[PDB]
Amino acid sequence: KFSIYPPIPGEESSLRWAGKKFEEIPIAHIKASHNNTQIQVVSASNEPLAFASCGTEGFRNAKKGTGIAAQTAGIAAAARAKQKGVIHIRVVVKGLGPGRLSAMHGLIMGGLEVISITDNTPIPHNGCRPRKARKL
């Protein structure tokens, strides 16, 4: 029982959460970089609901790419989502960095429930040419 694969939208989708299926669940995109992260909760109908990041609190310079700042941003985003009624979210991780799971922990501790951990890292398939290798 309990298949790790996501349910297909096709035939009968037998998983219910608060009277809703899976395609009608709001999304919580997280763009975690090497020094800053942003958390925005968007509904299923593509409508912005909440937006909280490290720069919208009090952290400056390299203090944004920390675990405490990411956790506070996640807690603030979860509170702003609960103020309007979201409950269930779908975390989307974009990029690597120190604050990759701190935002998820903050969103969970804020009062939200996570049922699917997704990530769409934009890894280029020999795409654009990055910058030159710096000399440490």
């Binding site: 675990g67 405490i68 956790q71 506070t72 807690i75 922990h105 501790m109």
Partner: protein
Amino acid sequence: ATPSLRGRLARFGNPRKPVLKPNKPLILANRVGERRREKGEATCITEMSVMMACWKQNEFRDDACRKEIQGFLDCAARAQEARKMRSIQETLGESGSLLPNKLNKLLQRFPNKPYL
């Protein structure tokens, strides 16, 4: 399964470009390298974060956020005792892997003879 090593090194009987270009000669030794340990952890931060948040929300008194501060103290004590038991166990106990001492002893018991 180990891959092939026929046409890899640049030899006299290989009329092609060398695939593998090692810096050291491919001769196995009779010693096991020391494993890595004691890295950067920096754990137990959510308790401190929520304690600072509770202190910033209300007043800076001690009787206002007793639950958060006692949870932080308990988490710190648990982390300390976990580090202590880790340092104690990682000196005589082996789980999954083995001790490099016995490994190099067994390698010296059956050494390699590449010089024939």
